Amino acid sequence: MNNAGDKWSAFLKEQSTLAQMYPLQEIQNLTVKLQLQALQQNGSSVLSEDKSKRLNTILNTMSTIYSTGKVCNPDNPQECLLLEPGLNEIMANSLDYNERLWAWESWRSEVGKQLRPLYEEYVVLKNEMARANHYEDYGDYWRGDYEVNGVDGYDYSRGQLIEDVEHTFEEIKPLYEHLHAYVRAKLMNAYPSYISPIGCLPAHLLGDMWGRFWTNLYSLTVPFGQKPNIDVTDAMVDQAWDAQRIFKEAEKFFVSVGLPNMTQGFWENSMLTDPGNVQKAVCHPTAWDLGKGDFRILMCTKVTMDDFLTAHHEMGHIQYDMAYAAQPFLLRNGANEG
Amino acid sequence: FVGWSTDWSPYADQSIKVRISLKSALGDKAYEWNDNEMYLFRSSVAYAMRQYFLKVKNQMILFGEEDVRVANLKPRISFNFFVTAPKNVSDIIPRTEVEKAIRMSRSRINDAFRLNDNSLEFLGIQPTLGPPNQPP
Amino acid sequence: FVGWSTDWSPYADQSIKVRISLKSALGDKAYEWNDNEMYLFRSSVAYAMRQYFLKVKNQMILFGEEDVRVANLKPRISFNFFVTAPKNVSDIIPRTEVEKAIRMSRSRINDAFRLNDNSLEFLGIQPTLGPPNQPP
Ligand SMILES: *[C@@H]1O[C@H](CO)[C@@H](O[C@@H]2O[C@H](CO)[C@@H](O[C@@H]3O[C@H](CO[C@H]4O[C@H](CO[C@H]5O[C@H](CO)[C@@H](O)[C@H](O)[C@@H]5O)[C@@H](O)[C@H](O[C@H]5O[C@H](CO)[C@@H](O)[C@H](O)[C@@H]5O)[C@@H]4O)[C@@H](O)[C@H](O[C@H]4O[C@H](CO)[C@@H](O)[C@H](O)[C@@H]4O)[C@@H]3O)[C@H](O)[C@H]2NC(C)=O)[C@H](O)[C@H]1NC(C)=O
Ligand SMILES: *[C@@H]1O[C@H](CO)[C@@H](O[C@@H]2O[C@H](CO)[C@@H](O[C@@H]3O[C@H](CO[C@H]4O[C@H](CO[C@H]5O[C@H](CO)[C@@H](O)[C@H](O)[C@@H]5O)[C@@H](O)[C@H](O[C@H]5O[C@H](CO)[C@@H](O)[C@H](O)[C@@H]5O)[C@@H]4O)[C@@H](O)[C@H](O[C@H]4O[C@H](CO)[C@@H](O)[C@H](O)[C@@H]4O)[C@@H]3O)[C@H](O)[C@H]2NC(C)=O)[C@H](O)[C@H]1NC(C)=O
Ligand SMILES: *[C@@H]1O[C@H](CO)[C@@H](O[C@@H]2O[C@H](CO)[C@@H](O)[C@H](O)[C@H]2NC(C)=O)[C@H](O)[C@H]1NC(C)=O
Ligand SMILES: *[C@@H]1O[C@H](CO)[C@@H](O)[C@H](O)[C@H]1NC(C)=O
Ligand SMILES: *[C@@H]1O[C@H](CO)[C@@H](O)[C@H](O)[C@H]1NC(C)=O
Ligand SMILES: *[C@H]1O[C@H](CO)[C@@H](O)[C@H](O)[C@H]1NC(C)=O
Ligand SMILES: *[C@H]1O[C@H](CO)[C@@H](O)[C@H](O)[C@H]1NC(C)=O
C-alpha cells in the first residue's frame, strides 16, 4: 500500500507540474478549467526543501504527540491512562466534579503545552505557503473549497463564506440559548454549588473531553426519563436479523425512492461481517470507490439499531459515489466537502 | 434565566477586588496610574505573598509580578486580582490565604503608594483602628 | 603590582552602591532584611527605570526584578547593583541614566521601605534639601 500510494502521489505531482502549461487566463471550458484548477494547485510543493521538511516534521510530531498523549499519576508513573480508553469514559460517565476537572486539566496540560510551540511554527509555515500560492492567509486557502468564479449567478467569493456563516449563526442563536438554559438548569441538580444559574457551563461538565458533543449529557438532561426511548435491537434479535439482511433492507429503502439497485460484485467483495480473530481488519464503517464500477463497504456490523443506521449512512455514501461514475475521475467527488 | 454572563467563572470566587482613590488621599501632587504603577502593585502583592508564606507556613515560594493576575481595570482604579502558583496557572491560592497575606503586610503596600487604609480598599479586608487606652 | 584582585571588572564602573541603615531610621519596630526585601528593592529599582524610560526617552522598556543584578551583600546592608537590558545581559544601562532614574523616583523608593534620604544612601546621588524661602 505504501508503494502504491507513493507511485500515485509521484504521478499526481508530475502531472501537476505538467498542467502549468495551460494558464487559466485562456481556458474557456468550465469543466476543463475546473480539472486544470484541481490538478494545478501546487500545495506544499511551493515551499523550499528545508521549509517543506520542517513542515512535515512538525505535522508528524503533533500527530504523534496527540496519539501518544497519556495522563500519569505522579505517585506511580508506570500506570497511565490514554485518550481513547478510560479517559473518555471518565469524561462521559463520572459524576464527580473534581475527577472530571482532573481529567480535563491533565489532558489539556500534558498535550496542549507540548503542542503550543509546534503549533506556532505550523501557523507561520502554513501562512508562508498560502501567501506563496497567492492567498492572503491559510484560512483563505481552506475557505477556497467553496469558491466559485466565472459561473453567472452561481459565483461565490472566499470572503462571502465568513459573512454567510456569521449571519446563519445569528439566526441559530435563539434556539441555542434556550437549549443552553435548559441544560444548565438540569445540570444544577447533578453538580450542585458548581453551576451558577446566571453564568456559563464549566468546560469539564459537558459530557465530552472538549465539549464538541453534548450527547453523553443526555442521561442528565432527559425530558421524561420514565418513558423509554424507541429501541428495536431486541426486536431484531427476536426475528434473527443477521448482518446480511439489513443491507438488503437498506437497498430496498433506497430503491423505493427510485435509486438504482446494488452492483453484482458489491455483495461478493464486501465484508459486511467481522472476519473474527483469524483475519485482522479495521472496524470503522467506510465506503470505498475503487473505480471502474467497484463500490464496496467495510463494516464490522453487529446486530444493533445503530448498526442499521450506520449501514444506511454508508449505503448513502455508496449511492453518492455511484451517481457520478460517468464524471471524469477528477470530478468524481461531491460538490463540496459537506 | 435565559442567556449567560461573560463575567462569571468557577474561579471568580478567589478574586480580590481593589479600589484605589489617588486624588482624594493626595489631592494635588498625585501621580497617574499607568502601567508602571500596576507593575509596582503586582510586585508589592507578590512580596506580601512571599512574606506570608515565609513567616507562617515556613515555605519558600518564589512569587513574581506575573503570578498576580489582574483584570477589570477601570478609570476609578478598581480591579480584581488573584494570585496563582509560581509557575503553574491552574493552581490558585485560596482567597483566605491571600487575605491573611494582605493583612500581614498591608502597611508596606500602603506606604509604597502613599495611601492610608481608606484610599486603598481591598473590599473584604477591613482595618482595625486600635483600642482607645483609658487614663488610670 | 604582582597579582590580581578578583573584584575588578571592566563593567564595574557602571555599578551603583547602596547602603541601608534600618535600625537608625526606625530604631525599634524595624523589619529584617531577608530575600523578600531584596526582591522588593529590585522591583522598586526596575519600576524607577521604567518610569525614567517612559517619561523622558518615550521608550516602553519592560524591565523586571531579574534585570537589576545585585552583588556584594553584607550585614550592613550595603551592596552593588547594576541594571541591564530587559532580556540581554551583555547590555548594561550606563550609570548616568541609572542615576537620573534614581533621582526621578527616589521618593517612591524611600517610601517603599519607610526610609528618608539618610538611611538609604546611593553613594553618588545626593539629595537636595530645598531653598529656604525668605520673609518679605
Ligand atoms: C498545577 O496545579 C494543579 C492544581 O490546579 C495541579 O492539579 C492537581 O494535581 C493533583 C496531583 O496530581 C491532583 O490530585 C490528583 O487527583 C486525581 C483525580 O482523581 C480524584 O479526583 C477527586 C479528587 O478528590 C479528592 O479530594 C476529595 C476531598 O478531599 C476526596 O473526597 C477525594 O477522595 C479525593 O481525595 C476524587 O473525587 C476522585 O474520586 C475517585 O475515587 C472515588 C472513590 O474515592 C470514586 O467514587 C470516583 O468515581 C473517582 O474514581 C479521584 O480520587 C487522583 O487520581 C490523584 O490520586 C492519585 O495519586 C495520589 C497521589 O498523588 C494517590 O494518593 C491516589 O491514590 C491516586 O493514585 C490525585 O489525588 C488534582 O486533582 C489536580 N487538580 C486539578 C484541578 O488538575 C497540578 O498537578 C499542578 N501542576 C504542577 C506541575 O505542579
Ligand atoms: C545585547 O547587547 C549587546 C551590547 O552589549 C549588543 O552587542 C552590540 O551589538 C551591536 C549591533 O550589532 C554592535 O555594533 C556592531 O559592532 C560591530 C563591531 O565592529 C566595529 O567595532 C567597533 C565599534 O566602534 C563603533 O563606535 C565607535 C565610537 O563611536 C566608532 O568610532 C566606530 O567607528 C564604530 O562606529 C569599531 O571600532 C570597529 O572598527 C572597524 O572599522 C574601523 C574603521 O572604522 C577599523 O579601523 C577597525 O579595524 C574595524 O575593522 C567596527 O566598526 C560592527 O561590525 C557593526 O557594524 C555593522 O553593522 C552596522 C549596522 O548595525 C553598520 O552600520 C556597519 O557598517 C557594519 O555593517 C555594529 O557597529 C556592538 O559592537 C555590540 N557590542 C557588544 C559589546 O557586543 C547585542 O547586539 C545585544 N543583543 C540583542 C539580541 O539585542
Ligand atoms: C468541455 O470539454 C468537455 C470534454 O471534452 C466537453 O464534454 C464532452 O465530453 C465528451 C467526452 O470527452 C466529448 O466527446 C464531447 O465532444 C464533449 N462535448 C460535448 C458537447 O459533448 C464539454 O462539452 C466542453 N464544454 C464546452 C462548453 O464546450
Ligand atoms: C506553482 O508554482 C509554479 C512554480 O513552482 C508557479 O509558476 C505557479 O504560478 C504556481 N501556481 C500554479 C497554480 O501553478
Ligand atoms: C435488486 O436487488 C435485490 C437484492 O439485492 C433483488 O432481490 C432484486 O430482484 C433486484 N432487483 C431486480 C429488478 O432484480
Ligand atoms: C487593630 O487590631 C489588629 C488586631 O485585631 C492589630 O494588628 C492592629 O495593629 C490594630 N490597629 C491599630 C492598633 O492601629
Ligand atoms: C532640591 O533641589 C532639586 C532640584 O535641584 C528639587 O527637585 C528637589 O525637590 C529639592 N528638594 C526639596 C525642595 O526638598
Residue numbers in the entry:
A (entry chain A): 62 to 399
B (entry chain A), C (entry chain B): 603 to 738
What do the study's own words say?
Several plasma membrane transporters import proline into the cell, including the Sodium/imino-acid transporter 1 (SIT1) encoded by the SLC6A20 gene. SIT1 belongs to the SLC6 gene family of amino acid and amine transporters, and the larger Neurotransmitter Sodium Symporter (NSS) superfamily. SIT1 adopts the classic LeuT-fold expected for this family of amino acid transporters, while ACE2 is composed of peptidase (PD) domain and collectrin-like domain with transmembrane and neck regions. As with the homologous ACE2-B0AT1 complex, the structure is a dimer of heterodimers where homodimerization of ACE2 is mediated primarily by its neck domain while the ACE2 and transporter subunits interact via three distinct sets of contacts.
Further classifying the 2:2 ACE2-SIT1 complex data, there are two distinct conformations based on the relative domain orientations within the ACE2 dimer. This movement between open and closed conformations occurs as a 30° rigid-body rotation around a hinge at residues 612-617 in the loop between peptidase and collectrin-like domains. Further, the branched N-glycan chain at ACE2’s Asn690 is rigid and well-ordered in the open conformation, hydrogen bonding with asparagine, aspartate, and glutamate side chains on the peptidase domain’s H6 and beta-hairpin between H4 and H5. Accordingly, the glycan density is weaker in this conformation as the chain becomes more mobile. Within the SIT1 binding site are two non-protein densities, identified as pipecolate and chloride based on size, local chemistry, and similarity to structures of other LeuT-fold transporters. As a sodium and chloride coupled co-transporter, SIT1 has obvious binding sites for two sodium and one chloride ion. The density for the Cl- is clear in the experimental Coulombic potential map. Therefore, we propose this structure captures the sodium, chloride, and substrate-bound inward-facing occluded state of SIT1’s reaction cycle.
